[PDB]
């Protein structure tokens, strides 16, 4: 089995979102041990109990801000002291907003760009230090977005940040190959979530459906394949790429 | 198992190359039935026997020119009459040469471009008609090359044809979605093969190795994961993309 | 004046089209000499007179098929014997159609792909030999289309050939640089011309307008700048690129 | 003359660099008025006198940090109060460094990413408000780098920020079309300047020269054509693009 991730430790940021939950559950279901973090601890204790109960894998929870480097480092040290080495980092931290181009302020910018671009970078740096010390030839997966190359209205800093992370992915792959660490991205299209429930089920968003070739928004399960590929031996010869999962959304006329 | 291909029928063009053999053996090992074709049938006979004996799957062989539309059409008819419907087409036919930009002629151009771009298009058209006829929601995988976006010297018609195929993959993904058929590409880097042993093991090619981030040419095994992804349920939400498998070669420092 | 093209010889294939007429008139206006070819000599005679009369530059006409290498070569030899050396090749031969993906046949494929991709390649080879023989460091400009990276319905072989020509432009730049020849592309969006008046004035085309950021189809004049840039000293440090002229069409949400 | 910029006001950030001086002189030479800023007012005065003396155009200088949003805003208000309206914003702000991937710290990141990406975004926002207030249909030009899509070692945050700026250019193009403002980028390759004498004039860098198809580093003059195209009427039908000026470097094998 080339997609085997059993007994690995998967570190997942942005773990309290619907996507964060799905990812953790996917890897626990495949027999991987899970390290989940988010800003607020209470949402993770819940996910933790469920995962331990359903799958019996090891689960570690950490509350921290992904932009707090010393917090991430302190998380890794805490893991190292318990004898744990991270195999795969999944950078899934992400915030956005909807504002006209001229209405975004410096505060909006710092929040969106630091969360979507700076934080994955910091986290990758620290996890890589940790992997290198343990001589572990792991993997890094960046959750980007089709908005890293496609555009939409009202989401300018998000687009900027995603595009930055996509190119950073390529550069990281080039600079980290010497440590045997591959670095790749997965770019989802529009996923049906509650943060954009009003938007998608509306009539204006329903017209989007008719532009998307599969006539369907992205389901979490659509991500399963690429996630397992990029986190396992199956993906070891692959580095520096971005896999779009969008039902052809980005290729539409 | 979301990567399940058991009992599917996989159609593989260009099956007589080392890569084609590898692909055939990969899907057979995963319990899938195999349809292989190439120009010379005799080049397929060992593989058929190995596969029947070792994996116990169905194997159909066909001799044809990938540029012969009626031959492809006749093959598909023959499969239908045996109750066989193709689940996945893997377009893996590919030729090249090495010539200065100005030394390539009309004959070279027609050979390289018709084989690399026109034939996969013909096969896709015919396989799609066959799938539709059987009301089947299948998959198409185009083997391109990192040369669909990167350049090299002495391979201009190959680069043009691969970029052509890459964009056609995207266009087909859009136009075929209505039939439940997803269309994707795999772009290998330089694979350690025997048609290019001299190029790769030489001085000019050994300098190439140090440019590649992993400092390894592409192994056939590197392709297994993407192939299984794009041929199975795991990949159903994915259409119109090209997965590069190159150890970072195309990202390498300018 | 870095955009100077006075006294150059500009070779324009596809000269009988609306765009071809426009390009010819553009360069004549700038004091450049004009070599135009198309299949039917009579459509070029009107253009020839119009140009000779208004601008007083040299005009050479050739009736020939652009897919005929021997004809193209004889045209050049003919020019060489008169002491004329081409400075700029503008590859503007291009035909298309509108058919469902499964309705395009082998004949459609050959006409479309040979004219849009094979011919500019043949002409480029022949023009380059002509330049090399005269020890001349000229330019090649391939007219592609935004459909070289974007998609639309019913134009599958056109898209393939344009994407092919786009990458071919990059490869040619690399391979012809040693002869001092730069190679670039201009990719127009949907041009308000007479060859696609029905598509654009239809309702499927009116829905296009509100999607395009400038709310305008492309005017021929929008190409003037890129044409003069890539044909003059102004463009000498530029090779291997494709300039999109489309009012943001390829970036639209 | 479709490239006319006579009497326009061109706003140039990063004006104290070698490139900034060149851009100021280019536009002054073409009869356009110049608004230049840099951190230290003293570095701008030499240029100011030279331009006022040689071309006799209006020159306005401002000391500011391009990351200081309120200072940029005050500059524009100051200009508004004098009856001046900016026609073209040229974002020419850019800093970098050389460090292995894991050696870059939070302070480096902030300096590089805020200067290369956040600042042009702030300036663009402020300048658009200024244009809209004056009902003026101008242009924005972002100086990116071929490193917005290509990679190199030791420059990871620069790559991120430039890729960020590249996609932001496309997004802004879409969102600002409604105001008659086009947004484009110029991506130079490696420029032979005095600020980078060691990497380039040495032999370690000389192996790159053999990689570049033209065998030439980028000269400032190579940018002249694209700059005038994108700042004038010649470029009005163009929005959302990046013009690479690199002698085919990014296309190299």
| Chain D CA closest to residue C243 | D243
Residues B60, B35: contact at Cβ < 8 Å?
A: yes
Q: What share of chain C is helix, strand, coil (3-state, %, to 5)?
A: 50, 15, 35
User: What's the burial of A134, exposed, middle or buried (CB within 10 Å: 0-12/13-18/19+)?
Assistant: middle
* Ranges of each domain in chain C: 1-253
Instruction: List phi, psi (to 5°) of B25.
Output: -70, -35
- Rounded Cα distance between C250 and A251, Å, is 11
The H or E element containing residue B11 is strand B9-12
Identify which of B103, B85, B104, B82 has the alpha carbon closest to the alpha carbon of residue B95: B104
Collapsed DSSP state (helix, strand, coil) of residue C132: helix
Closest C-alpha among D1, D3, D8, D22 to residue D236: D3
Q: Quote the CA–CA distance of B127 and B76 in Å, as a whole number.
A: 7
Selected residue of C101, C111, C129, C140 to mutate for chain B interface (largest B Cβ count, 10 A):
C101
In angstroms, rounded to a whole number, what is the distance separating the alpha carbons of residues A159 and A153? 10
Sheet holding C33-38, edge to edge: C59-63, C33-38, C9-12, C88-91, C139-143, C182-188, C242-245
| Nearest-CB residue to C177 (from D173, D237, D248) | D248
Catalytic residue among B9, B55, B104, B158: B158
Q: DSSP readout, chain A? A: -TT--TT-EEEESSTTSHHHHHHHHHHHHTT-EEEEEES-THHHHHHHHHHHHHH---EEEEE--TT-HHHHHHHHHHHHHTT----EEEE---------GGG--HHHHHHHHIIIIIHHHHHHHHHHHHHHHTT---EEEEE--GGGTS--TT-HHHHHHHHHHHHHHHHHHHHHGGGT-EEEEEEE--B--STTHHHHHSHHHHHHHHHSTTSSPBPGGGGHHHHHHHHSGGGTT--S-EEEESTTGGG--
Specify the DSSP element, H or E, that contains B33.
Answer: strand B33-38
The minimum CA-CA distance between D153 and chain B, rounded to whole Å, is: 7
* Resolution of the coordinates, Å: 2.4
* D190 flagged as catalytic: no
- Distance, in Å, from the CA atom of B164 to the CA atom of C149, rounded to the nearest integer, reads 10
Q: Å from A242 to nearest chain C CA?
A: 17
Give the list of residues 6+ apart from residue B1 with CB closer than 8 angstroms, or none: none
> Which of A150, A151, A204, A251 has the highest number of chain C CBs within 10 A, making it the mutation to test binding with C?
A151
Length of chain B: 254
User: A233 CB contacts (<8 Å, ≥6 apart)?
Assistant: A2, A3, A4
- Answer yes or no: do B164 and C117 touch at CB < 8 A: yes
Tell me which CATH code domain B1-254 carries.
Answer: 3.40.50.720
Two tokens, residue B247 = 């150890």
Q: Identify the bridge partners of residue B61 per DSSP, sorted by sequence position.
A: B36
Chain-centre distance for alpha carbon B12: 7
D159 touches A: beta carbon within 8 Å:
yes
Q: Under an 8 A CB cutoff, do B121 and C161 touch?
A: no
With beta carbons less than 8 A apart as the criterion, state whether C91 and C141 touch.
Answer: yes
Give yes or no for a contact between C193 and C18, defined as CB atoms under 8 angstroms apart.
yes
Return the C-alpha torsion angle B226, A188, B241, B123, nearest 10: 80
The CA-to-CA distance between both ends of chain B, in Å, stands at 41
B242 forms beta bridges with B185
* CB contact burial A82-120 (16+ within 10 A = b; e otherwise): eebbbbbbbbbbbbbeeeebbebeeebbebbbbbbbbbb
> Do A91 and A186 meet the contact criterion of CB atoms below 8 Å apart?
no
Q: Which residue of D has its CA nearest to A160?
A: D164
Does A240 touch chain B if contact means CB atoms closer than 8 Å? yes
Phi, psi of B204 (to 5 degrees): -65, -35
- D187 vs B193: CA distance, rounded Å: 38
What burial class does residue D90 get, using C-beta atoms within 10 Å of its C-beta: 0-12 exposed, 13-18 middle, 19+ buried?
Answer: buried
Measured CA to CA, the distance from residue C170 to residue C175 in angstroms comes to: 9
Structurally, at CATH architecture level, domain D1-253 sits in 3-Layer(aba) Sandwich (3.40)
**By what technique were these coordinates determined?**
X-ray
């Amino acid at each position: 089995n080339i997609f085997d991730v059993k007994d690995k430790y998967i570190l997942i940021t942005g773990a309290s979102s619907g996507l964060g939950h799905h990812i953790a559950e996917l890897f626990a279901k495949e027999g991987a041990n899970i390290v989940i973090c988010a800003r607020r601890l209470e949402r993770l204790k819940e996910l933790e109990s469920h995962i331990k109960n359903e799958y019996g894998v090891q689960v570690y929870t950490f509350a921290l801000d992904v932009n707090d480097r010393s917090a991430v480092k302190d998380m890794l040290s805490s893991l190292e002291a318990e004898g744990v080495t991270i195999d795969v980092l999944i950078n899934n931290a992400g915030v956005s907003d909807t504002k006209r181009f001229l209405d975004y302020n410096d505060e909006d910018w710092d929040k969106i760009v630091d969360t979507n671009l700076k934080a994955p970078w910091q986290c990758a740096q620290e996890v890589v230090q940790h992997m290198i010390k343990a001589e572990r030839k792991g993997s890094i997966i960046n959750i980007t977005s089709i908005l890293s190359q496609s555009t939409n209205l009202g989401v300018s800093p998000y687009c900027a940040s995603k595009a930055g992370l996509r190119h950073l992915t390529e550069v990281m792959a080039v600079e980290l190959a010497r440590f045997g660490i591959n670095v790749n991205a997965i770019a989802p299209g529009y996923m049906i979530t509650e943060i954009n429930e009003e938007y998608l089920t509306s009539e204006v968003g329903q017209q989007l459906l008719k532009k998307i070739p599969t006539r369907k928004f992205v389901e979490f399960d659509d991500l399963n394949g690429p996630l397992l590929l990029l986190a396992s031996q199956a993906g070891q010869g692959i580095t520096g790429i971005e896999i779009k999962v969008d039902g052809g959304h980005s290729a539409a006329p």
